[PDB]
């Protein structure tokens, strides 16, 4: 009982501190900045060959190679520049929920309800792609495992617990705990010394990879958090809640800077990413289209329609050249 | 140029990949996928004697292959990994009949599954296991349905009942009452997009495979008829 009163007092004090910190508003500060304009990105490619719904994809470091995964149980390495199946990998378990591309471009990972995301070698001397390491130890289903280095990999499973592994030994080296609900997505920092995660408890947390402990928490969403991406300078980030609204957060100020929501949109979000310049914010809704938001003004910059079914994943190349979006119709469409 | 050799190798690799992928797609279309469900310790892992997310089964009937999955490793929370089965042939639902206390939870879970947005267009083959146990409990009379369901006091056996030889009127009435209670949720509002196929099975039943075969044939035929607009 006393602990409850202490927690309530601490929460009230934190809220008062944030309220005192707030002085102005982003729209008022940036009101004097002109609109970007109605952008009309037109499809430049269409990638075909995946039988079932597509859940996740990842760009390579060179902005020319990327990987996709679908429920049918196949891993395909495409080539956006020239549409070709560079490699095809059939998974042991037909169920998969995420895919990753090592920054070195020599390894990929993918996992799902099997509670494991394994390691595939793409620089085989024998020439045949084979699984090198499978990491076991997670309790719930694996929601997302993103690469950190050729030997370090991060993960977030269905048991409300992220994990930093070491493939050469395949042993959990640090455990991130403290999340009430399920963990959906994470986004590493460009400095690769931190990473923020979203969970199905209307909250997001910031960790320290070396020290392994939550550093801060943010709560401004009514429903679960599906996607989380990092601002390229590592001083802000935005999330897409299922409540049909996207918000922008700051680490230094530690408040919800701005929100993106209109009356005409009432569907849930599934993916989020930031354009290289940082002025454009992309959101993939549940009504079979993606929306482009003027990040610093929170006004509809434009629409990106032309998907038969739900748009699950989304991403922007490293150089901010091409945008790739996968959907439930089993098609990947690249936008200039 | 001397760089188009890489293009030739790329074309050869792409051709091989497509050639294999065609066979893979053919097989994947050929196979039929089913999702198993039901409360724990309810004959879920033993509905089929196996005479043919984590757990999968492979049984073939009349040169037709069926793929049934048993999600039995994940946590209790369900509203997120359930969506990964929105394109299955049908969902198998198994619910025990002699546990009046968990029966209400079974009704609520089934209703939520029926109303789920992303599963709005999937039919379910409903099962009702432990009929012998229900008969034993009814004959014993220690408990009573009325102590849980007040509406049962004003229920009567349907005129279309097909009782098994010697089936007591009391046990038959209870069975069909539970069946109607299940069916009411589905028939409430579905718009004809999907339906249910209630059954009366037991732990000793060995013909469940035939029943699911007939049910899946019927539903696929109904889908083929819905296309072409009847």
């Amino acid at each position, epitope marked *: 009982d006393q602990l409850r009163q202490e927690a309530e007092q601490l929460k009230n004090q934190i809220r008062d501190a944030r309220k005192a910190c707030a002085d102005a508003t982003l729209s008022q500060i940036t009101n004097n900045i002109d609109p970007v304009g109605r952008i009309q990105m037109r499809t430049r490619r269409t990638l075909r060959g995946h039988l079932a719904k597509i859940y996740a994809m990842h760009w390579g470091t060179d902005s020319r190679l990327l990987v996709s995964a679908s429920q049918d149980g196949k891993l395909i390495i495409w080539d956006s520049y020239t549409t070709n199946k560079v490699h095809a990998i059939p998974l042991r378990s037909s169920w998969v929920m995420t895919c990753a591309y090592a920054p070195s471009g020599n390894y990929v990972a993918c996992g799902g309800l099997d509670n494991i995301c394994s390691i595939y070698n793409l620089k085989t001397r024998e020439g045949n792609v084979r699984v090198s390491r499978e990491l076991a130890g997670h309790t719930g289903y694996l929601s997302c495992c993103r690469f950190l280095d050729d030997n370090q990999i991060v993960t977030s499973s269905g048991d409300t617990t992220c994990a930093l592994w070491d493939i050469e030994t395949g042993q959990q080296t640090t455990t991130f705990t403290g999340h*009430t*609900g399920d963990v959906m997505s994470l986004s590493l920092a460009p400095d690769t010394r931190l990473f923020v995660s979203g969970a*199905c*408890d*209307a909250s997001a947390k910031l960790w320290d990879v070396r020290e392994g402990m939550c550093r801060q928490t943010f*709560t*401004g*969403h*009514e*429903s*679960d958090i599906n996607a989380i991406c990092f601002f390229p300078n590592g001083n802000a980030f935005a999330t897409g809640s*299922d*409540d*049909a609204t996207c918000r922008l957060f700051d680490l230094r100020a530690d408040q919800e800077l701005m929100t993106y929501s209109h009356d005409n949109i*009432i569907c*849930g979000i599934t993916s989020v990413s930031f354009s290289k310049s940082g002025r454009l914010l992309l959101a993939g809704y549940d009504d079979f289209n993606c929306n482009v938001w003027d990040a610093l003004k929170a006004d509809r910059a434009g629409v990106l329609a032309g998907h038969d079914n739900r748009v699950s994943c989304l991403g922007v190349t490293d150089d901010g050249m091409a945008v790739a979006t996968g959907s439930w119709d089993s098609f990947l469409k690249i936008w200039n | 140029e001397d760089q188009r050799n890489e293009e030739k190798a790329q074309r050869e690799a792409n051709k091989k990949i497509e050639k294999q992928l065609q066979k893979d797609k053919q097989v994947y279309r050929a196979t039929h996928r089913l999702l198993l469900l039901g409360a724990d310790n309810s004959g879920k892992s033993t509905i089929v004697k196996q005479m043919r997310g984590i757990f999968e089964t492979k049984f073939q009937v009349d040169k037709v292959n069926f793929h049934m999955f048993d999600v039995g490793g994940q*946590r*209790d*929370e*369900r*509203r997120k990994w359930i969506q990964c089965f929105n394109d299955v042939t049908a969902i198998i639902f198994v619910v025990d009949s002699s546990d009046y206390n968990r029966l*209400q*939870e079974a009704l*609520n*879970l089934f209703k*939520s599954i029926w*109303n*789920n*947005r992303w599963l709005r267009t999937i039919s379910v083959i409903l099962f009702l296991n432990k009929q012998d146990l229900l008969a034993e409990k009814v004959l014993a009379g220690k408990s009573k349905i009325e102590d*849980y*369901f*007040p*509406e049962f006091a004003r229920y009567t056996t349907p005129e279309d009942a097909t009782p098994e030889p010697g089936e007591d009127p009391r046990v038959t009435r209870a069975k069909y009452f539970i069946r109607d209670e299940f069916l009411r949720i589905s028939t409430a509002s579905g718009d004809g997009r999907h339906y249910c196929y209630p059954h009366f099975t037991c732990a000793v039943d060995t013909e469940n495979a035939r029943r699911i075969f007939n049910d899946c044939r019927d539903i696929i035929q109904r889908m083929h008829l819905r296309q072409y607009e009847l």
Partner: nanobody
Amino acid sequence: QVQLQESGGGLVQPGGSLRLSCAASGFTFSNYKMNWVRQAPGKGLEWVSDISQSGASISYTGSVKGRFTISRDNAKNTLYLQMNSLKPEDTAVYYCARCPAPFTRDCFDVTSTTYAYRGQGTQVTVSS
């Protein structure tokens, strides 16, 4: 930010009246479907009642049919559940659970001591 405080409740003789309230804040109250869920001592959770967006659709469990009333008020961000004629086995922790999806009526919110948007509780016991 999501908070659900459940006031009311107390010791009452068998067959007496009562009233329970679930104060909520941090979200648009009118865009969610509310439920009451109880956990009898030495047992798991279980559904009790529910209510639709504007209060049109209502439902109840078997044992409370006709003995409990659920009332909602969106203009104040509060939700009541009037209780009348309670029996000895009515004693249990009561919660005010909201499932996440707005503008839908389908959800799984009786998780085994793991749900996130569930009120902390409001103890009510019946004694002689």
